[PDB]
């Protein structure tokens, strides 16, 4: 079945992806997992009282005492998420650059690739910070409960719920950072994003990422065959939630956002 030939590179690929992955992002899944269980204490926001007291105890990077904050928790929260998304786009861009061969793609296609993959890999990586009760925030300094989010007014309460539903099923796969490094790499190099004009060199890379992932999944998960196909089917699900997130943006929008994000959502799908 499986041999030990020049698959040494496949493993060389995964090591390289892991090493830049672990320094590209703040909180690895390993680290967040330890916080979600104890060994290491975030402030828990379950309450409007805990909210109002959370913004006091937690040091959010996007806020400064001198600036005007909207009297509107739903809006003060969207603010932080926008700031974090802007930062996440930059961290994902840096990671994309470390994927062997990416920087030699046509720069117009690197842009297209990053445009469609960012939020998918954002939702993928968000699960690493979630359990069934809530999600870690502020580099693990805070913890916002799932049920408090759902209680926010009007449509904002419907933003994070699909993400929780995704994370629950997705975390049951019990992937680790080493697996996550190669999976997001496979996401970024999706050769079926709309608007690509030099596909073949992208597919060639994705295949190398795909077979490196499969080999990684067999070596690291003896207790579950078909983990590979299950992940691929997850990439299908990540697209649907993006489609469902945009429609929600529209609802709110017809009732703004950082030029980088507006740049990303403009003419998406």
């Amino acid at each position: 079945m499986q041999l030990n030939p020049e698959s040494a590179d496949l493993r060389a690929l995964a090591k390289h992806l892991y090493d830049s992955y672990i320094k590209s992002f703040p909180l690895t899944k390993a680290k967040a997992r330890a916080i979600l269980t104890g060994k290491t204490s975030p402030f828990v926001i379950y309450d409007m009282n805990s909210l109002m007291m959370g913004e006091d105890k937690i040091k959010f990077k996007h806020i400064t005492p001198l600036q005007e904050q909207s009297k509107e928790v739903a809006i003060r929260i969207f603010q932080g998420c926008q700031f974090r998304s802007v930062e996440a786009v930059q961290e994902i861009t840096e990671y994309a650059k470390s994927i062997p061969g990416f920087v030699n793609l046509d720069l117009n296609d690197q842009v297209t690739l990053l445009k469609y993959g960012v939020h998918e890999i954002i939702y993928t990586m968000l699960a690493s910070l979630m359990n069934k009760d809530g999600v870690l925030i502020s580099e693990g300094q805070g913890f916002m409960t799932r049920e408090f989010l759902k209680s926010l007014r009007k449509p904002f309460g419907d933003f994070m719920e699909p993400k929780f539903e995704f994370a629950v099923k997705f975390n049951a796969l019990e992937l680790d950072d080493s697996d996550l490094a190669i999976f997001i790499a496979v996401i970024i190099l999706s050769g079926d994003r709309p608007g690509l004009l030099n596909v073949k060199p992208i597919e060639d890379i994705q295949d190398n990422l795909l077979q490196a992932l499969e080999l990684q999944l067999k070596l690291n998960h003896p207790e579950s065959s078909q983990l590979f196909a299950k992940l691929l089917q997850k990439m299908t699900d990540l697209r649907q939630i993006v489609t469902e997130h945009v429609q929600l943006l529209q609802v709110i929008k017809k009732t703004s956002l950082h030029p980088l994000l507006q740049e990303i959502y403009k003419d998406l799908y």
Partner: peptide
């Protein structure tokens, strides 16, 4: 469009 993104790839 994609000028902010295009700029980040150029680094």
């Amino acid at each position: 469009r994609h000028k902010i993104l295009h700029r980040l790839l150029q680094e």
